[PDB]
């Protein structure tokens, strides 16, 4: 009955934990004990982008590393040129409560979603020249937290109804549904090959999902509270998580366990966004105390601070060639750092 | 070609400057508690109310996207203690700590609230009404610091004069905010 199955689950959990403990040969800190420290990282604001009325919830760079999209809760989507501070597109939304945005790898599409439980796909390259809603995907039960285009016809969404989904924009129907979480899914990160992805949720756990087979492969449980952001290491064999316990953590897919923890004694606010630099040596992390921090990911000590915002930092991102870092904030200003 | 890029940018900003005027002239109201957006207008001023009944029972993640509304409208009809607990957790939230609450006691005792036997304001119904109002007001007037207040009302009718009340407390909220900013209150 219930008791026998619960006992079997407890036995399996102990078996998994001891199998993981058998492989903890050494620590990351001892292996990187003889590594020269990064130094001190001083970054400077190059551009400041001002066109939004309300707080900003999301941003996403393009593949050309020059154009970018941003979402604000006044009901607005804006596309900027980062070099010259122009405004290529401004798109008014049907709903004013938007929590996510994304950029297609080809550059012809953008996406958004929020408290309307819908994902809206916008076609930038209209033949007539005007941006119109190309598609409206609606099968989720709770709000949307994140979305990431795989290609021009596939997209992955995460919802506050504790499920993730893979869509088919041509037909607008769910192809695979990923159901293993017991709390809101808050973020997701596609692998460099786009064959797997990871998702962090409010049950204080993260999961690795196989896109083709639609099954969960590994679960990682180190945090203590809800996970807010999740990134993917450049070679796709590790990832990093930031949560409400005011810590970041690094996990390895091959060792199936946590490697490093990035925290300090005077940081008691939750992390809202994380990102990696091009070589994977620097971990950037946005906080609730209105500024971002830079972590030497191989040694777990701070190397710089990005303090330029007057309100909570909501979004943070690094370009593909790795030259600039954009951050958004609840004070309605985006800032680019170099 | 840079001239055309500047021209398109200037068109974008010319539209955004017109959008800013409409956005700043509306008041946005959350309608949690009981009974998705609905715009309306009273005495030539526009209000915009949102009812979020399409979500699930866990609120701690989508509640904070309402940190800049003018007021929250909390409707309440042990079902009184859960309402008191939700009011307490909304009142003390870090992102909703400057938002005022318009409270509508739609219920218009000694076993579940044993302190009713030592409470003095048929007079029994009025005594019960003011006991419940005083419960919510004892929660509200505890950790405000003067940045928000609670406006309790008693409603049981067809809800005719319920929109004049929202108008009159949304006026008071802004008047007190400015008088406090100018160091006059």
């Amino acid at each position: 009955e219930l008791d026998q199955l619960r006992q079997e689950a407890e036995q399996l959990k102990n078996q998994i934990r001891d199998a993981r403990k058998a492989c903890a040969d050494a620590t990351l800190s001892q292996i990187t004990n003889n590594i020269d420290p990064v130094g001190r990282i001083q970054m400077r604001t190059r551009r400041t982008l001002r066109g939004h009325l309300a707080k900003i919830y999301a941003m996403h760079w393009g593949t050309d590393s020059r154009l970018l999209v941003s979402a604000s809760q006044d009901g607005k989507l804006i596309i900027w040129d980062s070099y010259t501070t122009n405004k290529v597109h401004a798109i008014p939304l049907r709903s004013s409560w938007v929590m996510t945005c994304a950029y297609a790898p080809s550059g012809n599409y953008v996406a958004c979603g929020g408290l309307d439980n819908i994902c809206s796909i916008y076609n930038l390259k209209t033949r007539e020249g005007n941006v119109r809603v190309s598609r409206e995907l609606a099968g989720h039960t709770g709000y949307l937290s994140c979305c990431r285009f795989l290609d021009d016809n596939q997209i992955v969404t995460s919802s506050g109804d504790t499920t993730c989904a893979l869509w088919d924009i041509e037909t607008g129907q769910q192809t695979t549904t990923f159901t293993g979480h017991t709390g809101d899914v808050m973020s997701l990160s596609l692998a460099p090959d786009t064959r797997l992805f990871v998702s962090g949720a409010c049950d204080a756990s993260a999961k690795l999902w196989d896109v083709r087979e639609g099954m969960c492969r590994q679960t990682f449980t180190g945090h203590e509270s809800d996970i807010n952001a999740i990134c993917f290491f450049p070679n796709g064999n590790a990832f990093a998580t930031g949560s409400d316990d005011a810590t970041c953590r690094l996990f390895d897919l091959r060792a199936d366990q946590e490697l490093m923890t990035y925290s300090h004694d005077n940081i008691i606010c939750g992390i809202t966004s994380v990102s990696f630099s091009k070589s994977g040596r620097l971990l950037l992390a946005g906080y609730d105390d209105f500024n971002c921090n830079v972590w030497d990911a191989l040694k777990a000590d701070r190397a710089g601070v990005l303090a330029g915002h007057d309100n909570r930092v909501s979004c943070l991102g690094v370009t593909d060639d790795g030259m600039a870092v954009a951050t958004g904030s609840w004070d309605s200003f985006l800032k680019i750092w170099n | 070609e840079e001239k055309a890029q500047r021209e398109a940018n200037k068109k974008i900003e010319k539209q955004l400057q017109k959008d800013k005027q409409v956005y700043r002239a509306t008041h946005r109201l959350l309608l949690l508690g009981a009974g998705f957006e609905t715009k309306f207008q009273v005495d030539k001023v526009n209000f915009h109310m949102f009812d979020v009944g399409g979500q699930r029972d866990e609120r701690r993640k989508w509640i904070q996207c309402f940190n800049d509304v003018t007021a929250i409208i909390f409707v309440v009809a042990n079902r009184l203690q859960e309402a008191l607990n939700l009011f307490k957790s909304i009142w003390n939230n870090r992102w909703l700590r400057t938002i005022s609450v318009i409270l509508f006691l739609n219920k218009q005792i000694e076993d579940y609230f044993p302190e009713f036997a030592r409470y003095t304001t048929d007079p029994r119904v009025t005594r019960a009404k003011y006991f419940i109002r005083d419960e919510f007001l004892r929660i509200s007037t505890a950790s405000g610091d003067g940045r928000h207040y609670c406006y309790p009302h008693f409603t049981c009718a067809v809800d005719t004069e319920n929109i004049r009340r929202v108008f009159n407390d949304c006026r008071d909220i802004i008047q007190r905010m400015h008088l406090r900013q100018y160091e006059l209150l």
């Epitope: 509270s225 809800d226 005011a246 | 029972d57 866990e58 609120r59 701690r60 307490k88 957790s89 003390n92």
Partner: nanobody, 126 residues
Framework: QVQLQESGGGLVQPGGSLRLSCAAS????????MNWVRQAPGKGLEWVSD????????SYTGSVKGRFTISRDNAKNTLYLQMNSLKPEDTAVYYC?????????????????????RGQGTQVTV
């Protein structure tokens, strides 16, 4: 991983006393305030009591006030409930719950149908 295991309970005559215990692991006990929640057979989950990070603030639901006592032991990482002078209305399943985030003063979603940081509960029949 966050774990909360409840112990104590059983069948008792009216007027008797019980002591429920909740052992916690997988997090720092001292940064969180903890609650006792209860579900009666036939109704939904109902809040019962809560206590703060150190034990200064204690709150009870009205019906149980005066005859339930909550306490916590941060050194041994445990939470208690002393329940004397029980009544037949008290037969229910008792769960030990934790606030979502540390250092905060608002406890949200602790009595939902699906919460992630509450135990499996013990049965108390009177």
């Amino acid at each position: 991983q966050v774990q909360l295991q409840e112990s104590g309970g059983g069948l008792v005559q009216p007027g008797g006393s019980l002591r429920l215990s909740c052992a916690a692991s997988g997090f720092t006990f001292s940064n969180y305030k903890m609650n006792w929640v209860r579900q009666a057979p036939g109704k939904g989950l109902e809040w019962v009591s809560d206590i703060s990070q150190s034990g200064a603030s204690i709150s009870y639901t009205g019906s149980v006030k005066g005859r339930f006592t909550i306490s916590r032991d941060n050194a041994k990482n445990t939470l208690y409930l002393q329940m004397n002078s029980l009544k037949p209305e008290d037969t229910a399943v008792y769960y030990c719950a934790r606030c979502p985030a540390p250092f905060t003063r608002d406890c949200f979603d602790v009595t939902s149908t699906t919460y992630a940081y509450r135990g499996q509960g013990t049965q108390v029949t009177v």
